[PDB]
Amino acid sequence: MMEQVCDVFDIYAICVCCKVESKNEGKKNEVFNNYTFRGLGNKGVLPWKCNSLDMKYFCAVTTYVNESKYEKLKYKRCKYLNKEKKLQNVVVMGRTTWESIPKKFKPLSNRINVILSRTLKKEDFDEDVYIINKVEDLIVLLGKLNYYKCFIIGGSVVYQEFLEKKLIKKIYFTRINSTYECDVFFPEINENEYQIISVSDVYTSNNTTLDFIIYKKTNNDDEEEDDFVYFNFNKEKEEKNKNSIHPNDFQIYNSLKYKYHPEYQYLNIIYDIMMNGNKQSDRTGVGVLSKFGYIMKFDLSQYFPLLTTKKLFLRGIIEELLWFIRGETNGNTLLNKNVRIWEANGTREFLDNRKLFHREVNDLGPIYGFQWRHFGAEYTNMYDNYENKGVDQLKNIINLIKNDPTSRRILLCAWNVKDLDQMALPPCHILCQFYVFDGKLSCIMYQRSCDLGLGVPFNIASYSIFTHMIAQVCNLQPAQFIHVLGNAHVYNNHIDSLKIQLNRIPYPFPTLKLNPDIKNIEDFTISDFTIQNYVHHEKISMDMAA
Amino acid sequence: QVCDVFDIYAICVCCKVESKNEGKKNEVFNNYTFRGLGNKGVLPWKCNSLDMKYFCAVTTYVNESKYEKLKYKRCKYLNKETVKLQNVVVMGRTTWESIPKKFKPLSNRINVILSRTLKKEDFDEDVYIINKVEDLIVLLGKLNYYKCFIIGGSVVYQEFLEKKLIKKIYFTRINSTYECDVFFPEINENEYQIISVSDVYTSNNTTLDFIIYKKTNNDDEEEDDFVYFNFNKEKEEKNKNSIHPNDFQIYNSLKYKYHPEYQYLNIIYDIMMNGNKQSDRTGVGVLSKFGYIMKFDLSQYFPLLTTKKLFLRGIIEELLWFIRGETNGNTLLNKNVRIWEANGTREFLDNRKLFHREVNDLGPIYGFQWRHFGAEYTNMYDNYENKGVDQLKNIINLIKNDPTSRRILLCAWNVKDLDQMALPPCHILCQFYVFDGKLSCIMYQRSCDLGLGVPFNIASYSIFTHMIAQVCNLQPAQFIHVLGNAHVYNNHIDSLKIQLNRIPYPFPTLKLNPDIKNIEDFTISDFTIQNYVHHEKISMDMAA
Numbered sequence A: 001m002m003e004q005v006c007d008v009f010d011i012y013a014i015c016v017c018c019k020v021e022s023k024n025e026g027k028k029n030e031v032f033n034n035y036t037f038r039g040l041g042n043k044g045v046l047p048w049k050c051n052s053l054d055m056k057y058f059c060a061v062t063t064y065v066n067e068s069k070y071e072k073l074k075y076k077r078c079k080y081l082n083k084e085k086k087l088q089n090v091v092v093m094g095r096t097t098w099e100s101i102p103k104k105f106k107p108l109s110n111r112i113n114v115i116l117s118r119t120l121k122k123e124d125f126d127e128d129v130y131i132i133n134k135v136e137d138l139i140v141l142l143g144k145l146n147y148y149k150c151f152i153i154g155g156s157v158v159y160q161e162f163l164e165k166k167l168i169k170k171i172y173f174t175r176i177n178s179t180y181e182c183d184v185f186f187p188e189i190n191e192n193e194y195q196i197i198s199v200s201d202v203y204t205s206n207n208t209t210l211d212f213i214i215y216k217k218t219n220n221d222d223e224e225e226d227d228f229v230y231f232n233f234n235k236e237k238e239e240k241n242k243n244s245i246h247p248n249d250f251q252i253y254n255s256l257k258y259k260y261h262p263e264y265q266y267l268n269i270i271y272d273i274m275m276n277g278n279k280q281s282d283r284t285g286v287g288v289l290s291k292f293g294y295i296m297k298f299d300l301s302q303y304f305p306l307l308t309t310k311k312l313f314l315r316g317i318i319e320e321l322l323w324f325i326r327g328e329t330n331g332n333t334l335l336n337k338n339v340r341i342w343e344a345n346g347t348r349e350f351l352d353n354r355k356l357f358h359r360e361v362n363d364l365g366p367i368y369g370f371q372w373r374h375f376g377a378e379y380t381n382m383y384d385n386y387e388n389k390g391v392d393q394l395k396n397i398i399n400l401i402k403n404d405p406t407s408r409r410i411l412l413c414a415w416n417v418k419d420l421d422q423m424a425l426p427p428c429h430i431l432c433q434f435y436v437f438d439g440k441l442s443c444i445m446y447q448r449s450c451d452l453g454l455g456v457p458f459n460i461a462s463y464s465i466f467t468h469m470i471a472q473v474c475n476l477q478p479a480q481f482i483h484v485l486g487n488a489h490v491y492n493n494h495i496d497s498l499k500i501q502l503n504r505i506p507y508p509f510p511t512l513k514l515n516p517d518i519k520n521i522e523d524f525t526i527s528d529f530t531i532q533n534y535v536h537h538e539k540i541s542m543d544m545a546a
Numbered sequence B: 001q002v003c004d005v006f007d008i009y010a011i012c013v014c015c016k017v018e019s020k021n022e023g024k025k026n027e028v029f030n031n032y033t034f035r036g037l038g039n040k041g042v043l044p045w046k047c048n049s050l051d052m053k054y055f056c057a058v059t060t061y062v063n064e065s066k067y068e069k070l071k072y073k074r075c076k077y078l079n080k081e082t083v084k085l086q087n088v089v090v091m092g093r094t095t096w097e098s099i100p101k102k103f104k105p106l107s108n109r110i111n112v113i114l115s116r117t118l119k120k121e122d123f124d125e126d127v128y129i130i131n132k133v134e135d136l137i138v139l140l141g142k143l144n145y146y147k148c149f150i151i152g153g154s155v156v157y158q159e160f161l162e163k164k165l166i167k168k169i170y171f172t173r174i175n176s177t178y179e180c181d182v183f184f185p186e187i188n189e190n191e192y193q194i195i196s197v198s199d200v201y202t203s204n205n206t207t208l209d210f211i212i213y214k215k216t217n218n219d220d221e222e223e224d225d226f227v228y229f230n231f232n233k234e235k236e237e238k239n240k241n242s243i244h245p246n247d248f249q250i251y252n253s254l255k256y257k258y259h260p261e262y263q264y265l266n267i268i269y270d271i272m273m274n275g276n277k278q279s280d281r282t283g284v285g286v287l288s289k290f291g292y293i294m295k296f297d298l299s300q301y302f303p304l305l306t307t308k309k310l311f312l313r314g315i316i317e318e319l320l321w322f323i324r325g326e327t328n329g330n331t332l333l334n335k336n337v338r339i340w341e342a343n344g345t346r347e348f349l350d351n352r353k354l355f356h357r358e359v360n361d362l363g364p365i366y367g368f369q370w371r372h373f374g375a376e377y378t379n380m381y382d383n384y385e386n387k388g389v390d391q392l393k394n395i396i397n398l399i400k401n402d403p404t405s406r407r408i409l410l411c412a413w414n415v416k417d418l419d420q421m422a423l424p425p426c427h428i429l430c431q432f433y434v435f436d437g438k439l440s441c442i443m444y445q446r447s448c449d450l451g452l453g454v455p456f457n458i459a460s461y462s463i464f465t466h467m468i469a470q471v472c473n474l475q476p477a478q479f480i481h482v483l484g485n486a487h488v489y490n491n492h493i494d495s496l497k498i499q500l501n502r503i504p505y506p507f508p509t510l511k512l513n514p515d516i517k518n519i520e521d522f523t524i525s526d527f528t529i530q531n532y533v534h535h536e537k538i539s540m541d542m543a544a
C-alpha cells in the first residue's frame, strides 16, 4: 500500500483553457482532440478578457469545504505522518500569477494563499500569505496546516511541474470554446495518466460556450437504504439484448461518473435502445431495435445542440428549411444546389411504388413546404402557384406569437391526413408547438418515426435552427427546444458505428449566428447562417458497407 | 429502552373485507380499509405469487457490512455482551401450524414460535421458542441476527403493536375483497406514519402495492464533484415563497414514491414550485411549464387517480360518441354528459364567429375528423357515410396487418377545419406501437389543465387503448401521455395542495366485455371499473 502524496494531502489542480490561434492554413478539415483546449495565458494575463461563469465556478470550488469530512481527512494525514478558525482550502500559485491579481483581490478571500517564488521572499509581501521556494516545502506546509483541500491554481510553469511529479489527484479543467492569442499553454495531458470522469452541462458566458470537465488520475437514515433494496425486488428481468450488446464495448461511456453534457440526452437514448430495445423488422427487411416515447430538451440560449461525437454539416438542412419555408415541393430546387436529402424519394421507382404513377420525377407532392403555407388546398403539381390558397399556418403562428403570446394553440402541423397518400412519403416531423414567456420562445416538435443513427442528429439541428428563426422575426429570445420521440429506432446497420460513438466524450457545443437584420421569416438566405466554434470528433459512417 | 434498538419489524399483507350486509361496492375509504388477514386458518386469497416473492426477499435479505452499528448499539445498551448472519421470523403457533412440512422451517430464517404449550422438546435445536412476549427481547439480546420480523399472526400483531414494540410495518395491500375471520389492528396514524409507497402491480388476478409504516420519532470524492457541478443552479424556486413547501408536509416526508400516480402528482408539484406566472385567454391566472411525459403500465393497473374521486360514465360516452363520429352536442346532453355544453351555446358559438352554426352543432371536431377527415362539413345532422378518410378504420387495419408500421396515427388537428370547430382539439393525436402482441399508445396533448382535465384525459386514452387492443387481439401495454403547455389554474392551487398530501391507493382495474371485437360495437354496459379505492372528492375550485 504505497500511499500517494496527492491522495493524502488532497492536492488538486483547476484551470481553464481556450483554443489556440495556431495556423490551420492548408486543410479546411481541422482535426480535434482534447489537446485543442490548452491556451492558458497571454502577456501575463488571460487570453480572454474575463469569464464571469468560469470565475463563479472557480470561486465555488476553491472555497467550498465540508466540515464533517475534515474529521476523517485529519485522521488520514496524521497516520500518514505517524501523529496521534473556520476550515479553509489552500490555493497555491506561481509568483507571476499572484502579481496578476488586482490589488483589491489579494490575497484570494477565504483561502489560505500559498505562493511559489525564488526572486521574492516573505519580506517582499504585505499580504497574509505563505511563501515557498520549492515544491517539497508545500508538502511540509500542508502537513502543518488545517485545511480541507489544496488547489494548484496556475500558471503554466506551476501546472507543468506538479503534473510531472504526479502530485495532482484530479484536474478541474474548464474548456472555453473560442480562440484567442496565447503565449502560454497547459501541458499535454497523458491519457494513460489521466482519464476524464465527468462532463458538465454546457453554458454561454461573455460570448462563448464553455463546459467543465474533471480528469482523475488513472488507476495502476442509513436504514432507509434497505427499503430501497426491498422495493427493487421485482427488477428480476434485465436487458434483453445485453447478450448481443456487450456493455464491455461501452468501457469509456460507463466509466464516466457524471454525464451532464446535453449531448448525453441523445447518447443515453441510443444506449437505452441498445440495452432494452425490442427487436423488429421494418418495411424492407432491415431490422431495428425500438422503444416508444422519449423526450429531449436543449437550451438554445446556452448553445447550439449540434452533436460533437461525430461530424455533421448543416448547409443541406438549412437549404431544406429555406425550401420548406418557400412552400416548395420541387425536388430539383434542392438538387440544383447539390442537396440530395430528397433525391431518393423522388425517383420513378420510388414514386411508382407509392402508386404515384401520374407524378413527375422529383415532384414530391404536398409535403412539409406545401402544408406549412397551403394546408387544405388541392395539390396539382410542383410548378403551380397556389398563391393565397389553403391555410398559411406559418404566418398564423408568427402572428399568434406576436399578438397572442399566451395562446395554447400555436402549432405548425404537417400531418395532413387527407394528403398523406399524395405525399412522396408521410411527414416524420408531425408538428411543432410554441410557448412564449418573459420574451422567450420555446418549441416542441413531435417526431413519429426516429432514426437515431442518421436522422435525429440532423432533425435536432433543423428545429433548433427553426426556433432561432421564428424567435428572431417575432422579436424574442430563443429558449428551449423540446424534442419528443415516438417510435425511436436503431437500424442494425448502425450499431457497430454507434458503439464507437457512445465511447467518445462530447466537446462543448458550438453556437449559431443569424444575420440580425432579417425581420420576416421569408427573407432568410443560406448566407444569413453561421455555425461558430464547432469542435467535433471525426465523422463516422453509420453504415460500413463497401 | 425502546423497540428500535433490537430492530423489531412487522411484515404483513391485508386484503379488503366482505360484507353480506353491504355487498361489494364501497363508499368511504381510509388505510383501515385494508385489514383482511386470514380465513378459516388459511389466507383469505389462495396464493399471491408476487407478495410471496416479496416476503421471501425481505425476510431473507442480509447486510453483514451493516451489522457493525448493531453489535455496538445492541450490546452497548444492554450493558452486557453478545452472549453468516440471518434474520429472525417470529410467528404464532397457528401461523407456524399452517406452514406446510415441505417449506418448514422457513428457509434461511431463524424460526421462532411465541407459543404457550409448545413442547420445545419436539422441535429443532435451531427452532427457538418462547412462552411470553417479553421473552423475545431476551433471545434477541442473546443472538446475533440482522433483523427481527414479526410475520404473524393476527393475535401476534395486536399484542406487539400495543406494546409499541414495532419499528416499521411492511404492509402489502391487496386491492381485492375476500371472506375473512381474522383482521389486522386498526393502525393509529398518530404513532405510525407512511414513508414509502411502491409501484403498483398485478398478481393472481388482483392489483397490489407495498407501503411502509415507520413509527414517528416523536465515495466522497465524486460526492463533492456533485456540488461543483450544481454551482450555477438556483438557490430557491420561483414560487417557493408563494406556495410554501411546509404545506406539503406529507408529500415531502415521503422517501420513496414509486406509485405511478406520483407521475401526475410530481408534475403538479413541479409546476407549482417552478411554474411561470401567466395570464390566459380567460383573464384567470395559471402557472405553466412546457413539455412533460407520463407513462402508465396498463398491464399492471388502470391509472384512474386515487387521491380524489373521479367519475367515468361521462367520458366513456364521449368516447363512444367520438367512435360513432358524432358532432351533435344534444346526443350527449340527453344522456346528461355535459362535457361540451358550454362550448355549444349561442354566445360561445357567436364569439367563435360561428353565427351560422346551430346550437350544440360542435362542427368538424374529434368524431368527424376520426371517421371523415377531409369531408366537407355541412351540419351535425348530415349523412357522411363513406365520405372523408376514416382514420379509425385505417389504424385498426394497420395494427392488424402491419404492426411494425411507424405510421399508425390518429390525428384530430385538421388545420383546414380548425375555425369551423367550436374550439380546436386539445388531444392533437394518438400514435400506436405494437410489439410481441402488446399495444402501446402515445397521446400528445397541446393544452393541459392539470387540476381538472388531465385526470380525465388519462382515463379516456387508457380506456381507448384497451378498446383498440382488444379489437385487435392484442394486450394493452403502456399509455404514454405527452403534455405540451401544462398548466395549473391559480384557483386549483389550494385543492391540489390538499391532494398533494394524500397517499395514493393501489389502482383499480378495467374490465371490458371480451366478446366485443369491433371498435364500433361497444356500449356503456361493456365497461366496468373494479376495486376503485379513493380519497374523497375534492372541489378543484375550492373557491366555492
Ligand SMILES: NC(=O)C1=CN([C@@H]2O[C@H](COP(=O)(O)OP(=O)(O)OC[C@H]3O[C@@H](n4cnc5c(N)ncnc54)[C@H](OP(=O)(O)O)[C@@H]3O)[C@@H](O)[C@H]2O)C=CC1
Pocket (backbone or CB within 6 Å): A014, A015, A016, A017, A039, A040, A041, A042, A043, A044, A045, A046, A047, A093, A094, A095, A096, A097, A098, A100, A116, A117, A118, A119, A120, A132, A133, A134, A135, A153, A154, A155, A156, A157, A158, A159, A161, A184
Ligand atoms: N488559464 C488558466 O487557468 C490560468 C492562466 N494563468 C496565466 O498564465 C500566465 C502565468 O503562467 P506562468 O508564466 O507559467 O507563471 P507562473 O504563474 O506559473 O509563475 C512561475 C513563477 O513562479 C515561481 N515558481 C514556480 N515554480 C516554482 C518552484 N518550483 N520553486 C520556486 N518558485 C517557483 C517562480 O517565480 P519567481 O520568478 O519569483 O522565482 C516562477 O518564475 C499568465 O498569463 C496568467 O494569466 C495563471 C493561472 C491559471
Ligand SMILES: NC(=O)C1=CN([C@@H]2O[C@H](COP(=O)(O)OP(=O)(O)OC[C@H]3O[C@@H](n4cnc5c(N)ncnc54)[C@H](OP(=O)(O)O)[C@@H]3O)[C@@H](O)[C@H]2O)C=CC1
Pocket (backbone or CB within 6 Å): B011, B012, B013, B014, B036, B037, B038, B039, B040, B041, B042, B043, B044, B091, B092, B093, B094, B095, B096, B098, B114, B115, B116, B117, B118, B131, B132, B133, B151, B152, B153, B154, B155, B156, B157, B159, B182
Ligand atoms: N396476512 C398476514 O400477514 C398473516 C395472516 N395469518 C392468518 O391469520 C390466522 C392465524 O393468526 P392467529 O389466529 O392470530 O394465530 P397465531 O398464529 O397468532 O397464534 C396464536 C397462538 O400463538 C401463541 N401465542 C401468541 N401470542 C402469544 C403470547 N403473547 N404469549 C404466549 N403465547 C402466544 C398461542 O398458542 P398456544 O395455543 O400454543 O397457546 C396462541 O393461541 C390464519 O388464518 C392465517 O392464515 C397469519 C400470519 C400472517
Ligand SMILES: O=c1ccn([C@H]2C[C@H](O)[C@@H](COP(=O)(O)O)O2)c(=O)[nH]1
Pocket (backbone or CB within 6 Å): A425, A428, A429, A449, A450, A451, A452, A454, A455, A456, A459, B406, B407
Ligand atoms: O427527418 C427525418 C426523416 C426520416 N427519418 C427516418 C425514420 C425512418 O427510419 C425512415 C422513415 O420511415 P417510416 O417511418 O416512414 O416508416 O426515415 C428520421 O429519422 N428523420
Ligand SMILES: O=c1ccn([C@H]2C[C@H](O)[C@@H](COP(=O)(O)O)O2)c(=O)[nH]1
Pocket (backbone or CB within 6 Å): A408, A409, B281, B423, B424, B426, B447, B448, B449, B450, B452, B453, B454, B457
Ligand atoms: O380534454 C381536455 C380538454 C380541455 N382541457 C383544457 C386545456 C385548457 O385549459 C382549456 C382549453 O383552452 P385552450 O387551451 O384551447 O385555449 O381546456 C384539458 O386539459 N383536457
Ligand SMILES: CC1(C)N=C(N)N=C(N)N1c1ccc(Cl)cc1
Pocket (backbone or CB within 6 Å): A014, A015, A016, A046, A054, A055, A058, A093, A097, A098, A100, A101, A152, A153, A154, A174
Ligand atoms: C478563474 C480561473 C481563470 N479559472 C479557472 N478555472 N482556474 C484558475 N486557476 N483561474 C485563476 C484563478 C486565480 C488566478 Cl490569480 C489566476 C487564474
Ligand SMILES: CC1(C)N=C(N)N=C(N)N1c1ccc(Cl)cc1
Pocket (backbone or CB within 6 Å): B011, B012, B013, B051, B052, B055, B056, B091, B095, B096, B098, B099, B150, B151, B152, B172
Ligand atoms: C408471505 C405473507 C403472506 N406476505 C406478507 N406480506 N406478510 C406475511 N407475514 N406473510 C406470511 C408469512 C408466514 C406465514 Cl406462515 C403466513 C403469512
